[PDB]
Every structure is written in structure tokens, then in C-alpha cells.
Amino acid sequence: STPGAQQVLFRTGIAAVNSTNHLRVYFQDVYGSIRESLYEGSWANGTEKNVIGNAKLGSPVAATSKELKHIRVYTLTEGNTLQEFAYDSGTGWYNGGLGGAKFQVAPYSXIAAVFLAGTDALQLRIYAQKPDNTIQEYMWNGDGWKEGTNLGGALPGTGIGATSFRYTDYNGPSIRIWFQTDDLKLVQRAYDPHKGWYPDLVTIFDRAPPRTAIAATSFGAGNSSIYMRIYFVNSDNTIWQVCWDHGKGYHDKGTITPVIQGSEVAIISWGSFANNGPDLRLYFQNGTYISAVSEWVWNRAHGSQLGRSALPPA
Amino acid sequence: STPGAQQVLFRTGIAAVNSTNHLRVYFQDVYGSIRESLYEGSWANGTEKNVIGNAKLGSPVAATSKELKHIRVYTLTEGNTLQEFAYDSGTGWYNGGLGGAKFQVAPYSXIAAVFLAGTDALQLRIYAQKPDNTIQEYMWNGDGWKEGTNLGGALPGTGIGATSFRYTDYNGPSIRIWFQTDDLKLVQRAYDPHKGWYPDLVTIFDRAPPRTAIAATSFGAGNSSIYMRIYFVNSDNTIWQVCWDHGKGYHDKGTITPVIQGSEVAIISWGSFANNGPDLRLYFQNGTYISAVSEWVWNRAHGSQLGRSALPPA
Ligand SMILES: C[Se][C@@H]1O[C@@H](C)[C@@H](O)[C@@H](O)[C@@H]1O
Ligand SMILES: C[Se][C@@H]1O[C@@H](C)[C@@H](O)[C@@H](O)[C@@H]1O
Ligand SMILES: C[Se][C@@H]1O[C@@H](C)[C@@H](O)[C@@H](O)[C@@H]1O
Ligand SMILES: C[Se][C@@H]1O[C@@H](C)[C@@H](O)[C@@H](O)[C@@H]1O
Ligand SMILES: C[Se][C@@H]1O[C@@H](C)[C@@H](O)[C@@H](O)[C@@H]1O
Ligand SMILES: C[Se][C@@H]1O[C@@H](C)[C@@H](O)[C@@H](O)[C@@H]1O
Ligand SMILES: C[Se][C@@H]1O[C@@H](C)[C@@H](O)[C@@H](O)[C@@H]1O
Ligand SMILES: C[Se][C@@H]1O[C@@H](C)[C@@H](O)[C@@H](O)[C@@H]1O
Ligand SMILES: C[Se][C@@H]1O[C@@H](C)[C@@H](O)[C@@H](O)[C@@H]1O
Ligand SMILES: C[Se][C@@H]1O[C@@H](C)[C@@H](O)[C@@H](O)[C@@H]1O
Ligand SMILES: C[Se][C@@H]1O[C@@H](C)[C@@H](O)[C@@H](O)[C@@H]1O
Ligand SMILES: C[Se][C@@H]1O[C@@H](C)[C@@H](O)[C@@H](O)[C@@H]1O
Ligand SMILES: C[Se][C@@H]1O[C@@H](C)[C@@H](O)[C@@H](O)[C@@H]1O
């Protein structure tokens, strides 16, 4: 191992944000602090001087951004309430408003977060699991936090993946979320502005490990067209990918890379097939230096490759 | 799931003690409390009424006993010091002396504990991992806690299994400990009263998952003879067993039962092959009610069988 790597919690929550190839990765240290590693042409930070706040040990870690102008990082307090660390350009980091709402969730809740796509306005949708095991949406539309739509029952401790995109022919945002049901299937719920939350539940995987990690991205929005990728940890102790491609729908799935038992997973993307992309980066633990966070890369130049072996502070 | 099963921490530390078929099982709830479930002709307890103390979330949990007259349960404080919850018949539960010594260990340390075999005196040996990744023994011999032997380097966050037995031709106790080295092998170290700690590490398994759980038991001590069993979680997401049997040594190993990715494991035993035994009981998580603790049984009557499907409070 390395002393650095030993600072990273084993099975830490992991989240990532980006503006194209300018990246940030969030994780929890063994003391419960949430730290930020950074990529601006090289890997940096992730040290005890790069702490953005504290959360209960073992907390979920979620993040979403508008480029690197606005970053929001979501975790659980010791009281199992949702909280938010906020970065705005020209201010820096501060404690966001979410914590003050004291939204209480199940102690084993995961979190997913999106800024709504295709507007300049800062609108947020956060997803977590209430004590009754339902998935609840929480909303910020610029005038205070309030509950949004309740999306129904899920497996207690389900992972939650989320993405927002805006079709170029629509005048409002779309949302897709994924989670696991009691029967262990992985499913999608979907929001479009005309149909609202669709009264359906699309199965994307028939049977996954209980409380498997779930992470999702989308790219290449067009006229009534989108590309999506959902990742989870399968029973083979590897991350699997599920693909949605416009014109084919949910048409393929398969193994991507090995991970430790119970690894968490984060995904970021940029670009699209139409612009010499997309680019994908996954973050996870695969046993490098025992507890370091590792990266997997997809790009048009070289396809599927392992990226940075061990993120800072390793 | 069930409301009770939802209180059990997913990947909780697990420990167990017994006097023959009178059983106690310790685990951590989602709030960090350490709870006791019991078997006295039937299963009970494990509720908010059966809390014995508090420990850092995700703490190791180890326990040892002299029958059910003296029980000691070891975990980490938020400060990463060793602490002890103690039960003595008549006294009940109390905060043991160990905490006062403020022994600082790695935040990712595991714990093993034994009462030394073959004496009525209360003599304890506790094993944990220091920040320099060495395995340290801590001793109680009736006059305060002291550091004992340091057993050298180990993989950071290694599991630690321990047992003590007394050969019927010896005049003092033996100790065996197992842990994982940086190369990912699982090794034994051994103490006997004529040799002290043997200089050599003995490999019991060539390659195991990093930071796999390790738990051990022994039974059937005779003249220069013993039987031992060591359990760990393999890369196939099952508990494997490693067998020492007198006259054959370390001669077999294999899978026992499936578990959740990253399950912890506890083992208790009683009786012997000579006297229509032994009895073995393993405790682990295998996904029953998502987060319940389950039991596996070995006995002469029926051999290998699943036992209680979901321990109390499930
Ligand atoms: C073309 Se270098 C490649 O992409 C960068 C944006 C980073 O993800 C880096 O770790 C990786 O090796
Ligand atoms: C321009 Se300051 C730099 O980039 C911001 C987007 C944040 O990630 C901050 O923590 C970092 O130090
Ligand atoms: C100056 Se409001 C700030 O930004 C919004 C987009 C929300 O994240 C809110 O909780 C936060 O405090
Ligand atoms: C407008 Se949200 C309000 O102001 C922000 C700047 C933060 O202090 C946040 O915690 C608070 O709830
Ligand atoms: C305009 Se309805 C409002 O915003 C949508 C984008 C969804 O988050 C929905 O659940 C919410 O009630
Ligand atoms: C009108 Se297809 C709609 O949007 C796609 C992008 C998918 O999420 C599909 O499951 C959904 O029903
Ligand atoms: C046309 Se390759 C397809 O799309 C890429 C964006 C990656 O998700 C890759 O894993 C997949 O097989
Ligand atoms: C002969 Se019942 C058998 O043994 C008891 C001692 C308990 O382990 C119980 O759960 C098991 O089914
Ligand atoms: C006779 Se009290 C009963 O048995 C003791 C040995 C302990 O396990 C205690 O917690 C339990 O309530
Ligand atoms: C009446 Se001392 C009591 O029992 C000893 C055996 C030790 O476990 C010690 O730490 C504890 O406080
Ligand atoms: C009699 Se030496 C004393 O007790 C032995 C049983 C071992 O625990 C050893 O490490 C310790 O120094
Ligand atoms: C004099 Se064999 C001695 O004791 C056995 C019980 C085993 O632990 C073995 O590895 C060790 O060398
Ligand atoms: C004589 Se069967 C042998 O010993 C029992 C005590 C159990 O450990 C069993 O799994 C093993 O195969």
C-alpha cells in the first residue's frame, strides 16, 4: 500500500464532476472527511488540505455540476439527514442550503443528484431513500428546498443512479433514474415534460447483487434522441455496463473492469459520437495499493483502457 | 426485508461466544451501537433493548469468553483506540479497562481476542494493527493492560483470526493467529510455551481478496494434538474453510456457503470428534432479508446445513 492510499476509506462513496476533460473526484477518508482530487492536465490534491466537509462514516457521496462553475456534493450527516457542500466560481466552497431542510432518510440510503439540463437557471433534483424504503425526490428551483415526486418502493439500501439531459427539440428537461427493486432487478424510472414520470418501470438488468452500486451518465442529446450508460457491480466482482443507444434502445450489456467486493462507482462523460467522442471516465476501487481509487477510460482514440492507477492521495 | 433486519449494518462486524449450545452473537446496528443476540434453546434479543455499548461506524467486532461466565467484546472508538465491553456473571455489562490504556491503532485495523486456554485465571490476548501496519498483541494478566509481542508487518486492514488451546500434555497455553500479508497470502503465526512465537509464517492460502474477513476456531485438544478451522471470504463471494486435523496437518480447504460481497464472519465451536462432535456455527451475511445475519451449522447428525436463516432482530 502507500501512506496516501491508506487514507482512503475502503468502499468509500465516490462521485465525480467535470467540464470536458477538467475533472474533480470526491471520496471519503478513513476519518469521515470528504476530500476532492483534481485533474487539470495532471492529477492533484486529495490530501487532508483538500477537505470540503464531513459526513457520517460510510456515507453515500454524490455530486453534480454545471461545468466547473457550480459544483454540489451530497452526503449524509450523523443524523441521517441530507446535506450539501457547494462550490460557486468567485465564492469558493460553502455549506449549501440542503442541510437546513433536515430531510431525514433511511440510515442506509444512497443519494443521486442532477442539475436539470438545458437551462441557465440552477435547478436541482436529489434522490434518496426514506425510512419507508421509497425513493423520494427533493427539489431546488431557486426559492428554497422542498420535496418533489415520490417514485415508489425500492430495495432497502438500493444504489441510485441519475442523469438529466434535454432533447434539442424539447423545451424542458428530461430525467432518468435507476435503482434496484425488492426482487433484485435493476430498473429505470423516467421523466419527460409531457408525460411527467412515466407510469412504468423498465427493467435494465434481471438480477443484481443486493445493494449493488449504481451510476449513470448520458451524452449526445439530439432531436428526440439520447445515449445513456448505466454501471453496476455484478456478482462476478466486476463493473457491468448497460447501454442505451438511440435507434436501438437498451440493446447490450457486459463486463467492463474488475473491482473489489462491494466497490462503489462513479461515472462522468463529455462529448458525443458526433464530435469525436464520447469520453467516459469511471472511478472505483479495484485493490490498487489495497484502498486507492482507480480510473477506467473510454475514448475514440483507444477504446476501453485502464486510466490512472491510483488517484491522489495515493 | 423486515424493520429488524434493516437495523443490522450491512457488512457489520460479527463476533460470537458460547458455552456448548448456549450462544451469543454480537453485531453493529446502523447507528453504531453494538447489540447482542442470544440462543438459549431458542433465538431472541438483538433489539434496541440489547445494546452493550457504542463504537465507530464500521468498527471491527471481536469477542471471547470463559463459557458464559465472563464475556469481553472488543471494538474501536471514534478515536481509533481499542475499547472493551465486559460481562461478568452477577455484575452484568460494564465498560472494561482496556479503553483506559488508549491504545491507538490504524483506523482500518481489525481486532482478534482470546482468553488463554487451560486456566481458570482471566488472561487475555488482543491482536490489532498499529499505524505502521504491524500486528500488535495487547495483554491482560491481572495487573493492567500492557503491550505484548509485536508480530511484524501485515497487509493494511488485514483480517485477524485467533484461537487459544492447551494441549493436555503441556503446562501452558498455545496461541495461533492468522492474517494476510502484503502479497495477499493468508498466513499463520504460532505461539507455544517452549518456543514462544515461532519465527516462521506458515502459508494457509496462496491468494485471498484484499482485506478479506478471517475467523478461526480450534477444538479437541489432546496430547500434542489439536483440530483447527479457519474461515475467510474468497473471490467467489463464498466463505472458504481451511482444515488442520491432527495427523494430517493443513490438508484440505474448500467452499462452505455463499455470502454477500465483503461479508464479515464469526465462528464458534464445542465438543470433539472423540465425543460425537464437534459442533460448529458460522455467522455471516448472505443477503437474507437483505441485511440480516445468517447461520451455518456443522454437526455429526447432519453435517453441513444452513441454520437460522435470519438472526434476531430480523
Ligand atoms: C488523455 Se489522458 C486520460 O484522460 C484524462 C482526462 C484523465 O482521465 C487521465 O487520468 C486519463 O489517463
Ligand atoms: C478554481 Se479552484 C479549483 O477548482 C474548483 C472548480 C473547485 O474544484 C476547487 O475545489 C478547486 O480548488
Ligand atoms: C446561494 Se443558493 C445555493 O445554490 C443552490 C443551487 C442550492 O444548491 C442551494 O442549496 C445552495 O445553498
Ligand atoms: C440561499 Se440558501 C442559504 O444561503 C446560502 C449561501 C447558504 O448559507 C445556505 O446554507 C443557506 O440556506
Ligand atoms: C415541473 Se414538475 C417538477 O419538476 C420536474 C422536472 C420533476 O422533477 C418533477 O418530479 C417535479 O415535480
Ligand atoms: C420514449 Se423512450 C424513453 O426515453 C428513453 C431515452 C428511455 O429512457 C426509454 O426507456 C424511455 O421510455
Ligand atoms: C460504440 Se462502443 C460503446 O459505446 C462506448 C461509448 C462505450 O460505452 C463502450 O463501452 C460501448 O461498447
Ligand atoms: C440443534 Se438446533 C441448531 O443448533 C442451535 C445450537 C442453534 O445453532 C440453532 O440455530 C441451530 O438450528
Ligand atoms: C444471564 Se443475563 C444473559 O446472559 C449473559 C451471559 C449475557 O449474554 C447477557 O447479556 C444476557 O442478558
Ligand atoms: C475486573 Se477487571 C475486567 O476484567 C479483566 C479480565 C479485563 O477484561 C479488564 O479490562 C476488565 O475491566
Ligand atoms: C508468557 Se510470554 C506472554 O504470554 C504469551 C502467552 C504470549 O501472549 C506472549 O506474546 C506474551 O509475551
Ligand atoms: C508442532 Se506443529 C504446530 O502446531 C500446529 C497446531 C500447527 O499450527 C502448525 O502450523 C505448527 O507448526
Ligand atoms: C470430518 Se468433516 C470436516 O470437519 C468438520 C468439523 C467440518 O469442518 C467439515 O466442514 C469438514 O469437512
Author numbering:
A (entry chain D), B (entry chain C): 2 to 315
Reported in the publication:
In conclusion, our study describes a novel fucose-specific lectin, AFL from A. fumigatus, which prefers the LeY epitope, with the ability to recognize core α1-6 Fuc. The variable composition of its binding sites enables it to bind to various fucosylated saccharides, including those expressed on human epithelia. The probable presence of AFL on the conidia and its pro-inflammatory effect makes it likely to play a role in the A. fumigatus colonization of human bodies and development of the infection.
The structure of AFL co-crystallized with methyl-α,l-selenofucoside (MeSeFuc) was determined using single-wavelength anomalous dispersion (SAD) at ESRF, Grenoble, France. The methyl-selenium used for phasing was observed on the bound fucose, as expected, but also in one residue of S-methylselenyl-l-cysteine per monomer, indicating that Cys111 received a seleniomethyl group either from SeMeFuc during soaking, or directly from the solution. The AFL monomer is composed of 6 blades, each formed of 4 antiparallel β-sheets. Electron density corresponding to MeSeFuc revealed six binding sites per monomer. They are located on the opposite side of the molecule to the N- and C- termini, each of them between two adjacent blades. Binding sites are pocket-shaped, composed of different sets of amino acids, although some of them are conserved or semi-conserved.
